[PDB]
Predict the structure of Listeriolysin regulatory protein.
Amino acid sequence: GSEFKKYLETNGIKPKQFHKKELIFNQWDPQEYCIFLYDGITKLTSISENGTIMNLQYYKGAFVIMSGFIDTETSVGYYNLEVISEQATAYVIKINELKELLSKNLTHFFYVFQTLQKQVSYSLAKFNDFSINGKLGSICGQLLILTYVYGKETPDGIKITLDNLTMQELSAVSRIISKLKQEKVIVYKNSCFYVQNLDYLKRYAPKLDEWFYLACPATWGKLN
């Protein structure tokens, strides 16, 4: 992923900085971008004809988001990419530029292609885990990845090292979190979550666990 960052600068692709609540792009824009989120957390969202907000997906540092097809540069969906973390560094690239910078180096083309495969397998994993364990499956998944990505081993378990104010950017959900505390799966202490039963999470978010194991071997192993 770093290599793609060098490749972009050396072609005149310079990073921009965005902050909490800013919008790297929106559903009312006709432009088709390729967003190379190099650092930070963001969330893909969509607004109902009733103004209701619909958080569809979340993205973390190092990952790309094409808001249009390469095949025909037309929009793929009407969404919004909003920054959720403090800072955020992205490389905004018009679609056609992206398409050309790929032809020259098929390696990076592959990198982007894989990120797509990443989201596909992830949605399927999320979907499998929900069909099996309902909301309980979703929350455990939500928690499983947080653990794997932002979790750090302590004499208390695995602290979810995430901004206590970004966590808010993520009803019955309480029933489940309560349930979890009850069964000693997690614990809320010091404005942070501590997972004490990682196997419980892996149990109710199977496909998501697999997905993590298959798409992020390193991370995965650092706890298993």
Remarks:
- Helices lie at 2-9, 95-103, 106-150, 172-182, 198-204, 206-215, 217-221.
- The longest strand covers residues 53-60.
